Design a protein around this ligand. Structure first.
Ligand SMILES: Nc1nc2c(ncn2[C@@H]2O[C@H](COP(=O)(O)OP(=O)(O)OP(=O)(O)O)[C@@H](O)[C@H]2O)c(=O)[nH]1
Ligand SMILES: [Mg+2]
Lengths: 181, 13, 165, 415
């Protein structure tokens, strides 16, 4: 029942893995326990097709809580996607990064988020400013140890006020979690 | 809608 | 249109030679916690290459790819004598499965720029590649920064994938 | 500060789901519908339900519940305005939003629920700008998505340059059983349809009372706009300075401003109704509808609803002008007049029966509520004066307007 799905998923044709992952997140929509098919969609993730990678990021976001040890095979792909010339796929990878709620993963993700805060193109900056708050939701002292807050306050003094608005939102999110020290 | 418009002036100098 | 792996202990220059076969550059690469997959179209065969890193927490996650696996390339660590023993142990733990049984073997002596790195005969005797039944194995000395020995290994791989002219 | 935007159906199962923070478990929506059916039978229904530490902000669409769960002290009005904007975005991608649209377009709806909100914060919800890289048919995000002018994509070129305006009135009214007016306010809404090329800086001009008192024309007819709610696009600091309406319009239909003022003028359509409800026998409706406005105007397709009892039978309708259909679904008569000229006074007599065995429960008294529509006429008397198209390129556009008077909740209570 799922074995044909995995066999069609471990193919090499575009139209096979694309219909495979659409069938997967169609079964995820109706509420079927598709958590056991985790490490086979991760193999067919690195594609240049962008309508497909949103579905795989969706699967990585809805099923990293249930499979915490299996989700270690994604960090290289996110830190690869956070250097691509397309800014949409960078901000897509960045807002996919923080929602993965695994404590063992956030220790490696601090460097590309640090780079994307210092990016030029403001779309990925207004994504990464909220992703800082996503990361502070998981481990608060890790973000203070990495020193993102002093970099986060520098986007408040930036122009192009959407990055300013998301940075003020994230800072008000983090300062609510602090004891007001 | 079967209703028709009325043009307005531009500058109102 | 064949899949192929690149496994081995970490910091062995394997994603370096992967992106050297991909583009032809020597890129700055982090220690690969996850994995890389690209393809290299070469001699009318798309070499779909599956590099997996060699960190301690990601070695047991190699069995999740071993369902429907066709080929294998193992890359040694010639310059770390204290870790090549546990690299051989991870290899024989990988070679102790009846699931990956049809794959060919291809060993790359990598990072051949230091004088301390061994030749293409001593690594075989340290690993014991002769006593591996049903393993059509072959060794190759590869220098990562120059790119030598890579196309020869790909050509022997093409002679192993198809068994015809 | 939402946590998980859920979209349910009328049975309570999940049509589509999208969590952001993980502070609310994905099985917490299973406690929504039993809690709603529990609160339904004690009159303590609320848009904010409560399950321990998980609150359920929800709205009701056609067949859909857009539950947005939260755990902490969420900014509630943020969540509800987000949910109605999500409704508007889905109804701008989809011609209707029903159960048949979620399970057939899940390719794009997960993308939208990933794009509109991250970590519980709305960040990009203008649907027309969002049509440019999230399509059902991908390039870089346009510069309009990041720039300060975030509702108008530069590079749109049309053949003509048409500026359409619809200054649509909506008379609210509430007349008590005594025959006196309790509340009478007009909620008007200028609704534009812009077909312009370039980056225009329009300057709409009204006959505002404050602008004329600060101008010096304080003896002509000027509307006292008691409150104005402009769109995002209007420069609000410049409006607070000198009542000036300056903006860069979006591309397509939108609602520019929503003015709201009171009315010391008589109601437009008056419903003088009498009810001879004899017990157990019958009921007579010697209702009349006079039009208090000017003789020239022509109220199109009005529908004067009058609520009847629940169990009426054998109708008889002695009218003068305009037919009567009897709708027992809503349990009311719909005295539909096709064209209702001003100054006239039309009489209508409805006559039902009533069952001789009495009812078991009470009935309730809904109000007489008309559905009128008057073109080319404003009750408020607002007059747009000018519309200065300002473009760096330089052309002449054709600004068109039309005035429609509608109803809002034009209710008249019964005895
Ligand atoms: N001097 C020298 N150093 C090399 C050479 N090849 C690889 N290295 C070093 O070895 C490291 C490993 O190379 P990579 O391929 O980028 O990393 P990897 O082998 O995939 O190891 P993981 O990413 O942890 O899986 C590099 O960072 C280099 O510093 C080489 O030919 N000469
Ligand atoms: Mg690597």
């Amino acid at each position: 029942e799922i074995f044909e799905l995995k066999a069609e998923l471990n193919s090499d044709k575009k139209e096979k893995k694309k219909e495979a992952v659409k069938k997967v997140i169609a079964s995820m929509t109706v509420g079927k326990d598709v958590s056991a098919l985790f490490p086979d969609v991760v193999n067919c993730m690195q594609t240049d097709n962008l309508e497909l990678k949103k579905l795989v990021y969706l699967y990585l976001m809805n099923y990293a809580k249930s499979q915490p040890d299996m989700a270690i095979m994604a960090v290289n792909t996110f830190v690869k996607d956070c250097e691509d010339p397309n800014p949409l796929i960078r901000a897509l990878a960045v807002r996919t990064m923080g929602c993965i709620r695994v404590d063992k993963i956030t220790e490696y993700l601090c460097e590309p988020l640090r780079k994307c805060l210092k990016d030029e193109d403001p779309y990925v900056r207004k994504t990464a400013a909220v992703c800082v708050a996503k990361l502070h939701d998981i481990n608060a002292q890790l973000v203070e140890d990495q020193g993102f807050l002093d970099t986060l306050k520098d986007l408040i003094s930036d122009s192009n006020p959407m990055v300013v608005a998301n940075a003020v939102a994230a800072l008000s999110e983090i300062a609510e979690s602090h004891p007001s020290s | 809608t079967s209703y028709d418009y009325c043009r307005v002036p531009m500058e109102d100098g | 249109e064949m899949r192929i792996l690149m496994v081995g202990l970490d910091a062995a220059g394997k994603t370096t030679i992967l992106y050297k076969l991909k583009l032809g550059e020597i890129v700055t690469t982090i220690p690969t916690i996850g994995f890389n997959v690209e393809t290299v179209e070469y001699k009318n065969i798309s070499f779909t290459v599956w590099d997996v890193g060699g960190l301690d927490k990601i070695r047991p996650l190699w069995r999740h790819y071993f369902q429907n696996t066709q080929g294998l390339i193992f890359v040694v660590d010639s310059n770390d004598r204290e870790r090549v023993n546990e690299a051989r142990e991870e290899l024989m733990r990988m070679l102790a499965e009846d699931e990956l049984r049809d794959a060919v073997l291809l060993v790359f002596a990598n990072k051949q720029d230091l004088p301390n790195a061994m030749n293409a005969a001593e690594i075989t005797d340290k690993l014991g590649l002769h006593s591996l039944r049903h393993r059509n194995w072959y060794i190759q000395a590869t220098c990562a920064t120059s790119g030598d020995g890579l196309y020869e290994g790909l050509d022997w791989l093409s002679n192993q994938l198809r068994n015809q002219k | 500060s939402a946590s998980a935007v859920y979209v349910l159906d009328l049975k309570g199962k999940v049509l589509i789901c999208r969590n952001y923070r993980g502070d609310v478990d994905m099985s917490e929506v299973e406690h929504f519908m039993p809690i709603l059916m529990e609160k339904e039978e004690e009159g303590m229904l609320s848009p904010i339900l409560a399950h321990g530490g998980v609150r359920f902000m929800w709205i009701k669409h056609n067949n859909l519940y857009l539950v947005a769960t939260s755990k902490k002290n969420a900014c509630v009005s943020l969540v509800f305005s987000f949910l109605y904007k999500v409704v508007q975005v889905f109804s701008e991608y989809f011609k209707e939003l029903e159960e048949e649209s979620i399970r057939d377009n899940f390719v794009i709806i997960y993308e939208l629920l990933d794009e509109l909100m991250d970590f519980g914060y709305p960040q990009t919800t203008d649907s027309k700008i969002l049509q440019e890289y999230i399509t059902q048919e991908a390039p870089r995000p346009p510069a309009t998505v990041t720039n300060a002018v975030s509702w108008r994509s530069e590079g749109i070129k049309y053949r003509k340059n048409e500026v359409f305006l619809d200054v649509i009135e909506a008379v609210n009214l509430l007349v008590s059983a005594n025959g006196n007016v309790l509340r009478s306010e007009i909620v008007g809404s200028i609704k534009m349809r812009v077909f312009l090329s370039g980056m225009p800086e329009l300057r709409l001009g009204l006959n505002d009372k404050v602008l004329f008192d600060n101008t010096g024309r304080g003896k002509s007819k000027s509307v006292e706009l008691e409150d104005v709610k402009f769109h995002q696009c209007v420069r609000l600091s410049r409006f607070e300075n000198d009542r000036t309406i300056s903006f860069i319009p979006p591309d397509g239909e939108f609602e520019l401003m929503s003015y709201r003022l009171n009315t010391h003028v008589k109601p437009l359509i008056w419903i003088e109704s009498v009810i001879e409800k004899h017990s157990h026998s019958r009921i007579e409706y010697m209702v009349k509808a006079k039009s208090q406005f000017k003789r020239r105007s022509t109220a199109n397709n009005v529908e004067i609803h009058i609520p009847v009892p629940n169990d009426a039978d054998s109708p008889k309708f002695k009218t003068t002008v305009g037919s009567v259909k009897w709708v027992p679904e809503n349990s009311e008569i719909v005295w539909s007049v096709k064209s209702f000229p001003g100054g006239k006074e039309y009489l209508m007599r409805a006559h039902f029966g009533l069952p001789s065995v009495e009812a078991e429960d009470k009935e309730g008294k809904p109000p007489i509520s008309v559905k009128f529509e008057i073109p080319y006429f404003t009750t408020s008397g607002i007059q747009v004066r000018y519309l200065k198209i300002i473009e760096k390129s330089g052309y002449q556009a054709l600004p068109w307007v039309r005035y429609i008077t509608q109803n809002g909740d034009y209710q008249l209570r019964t005895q």
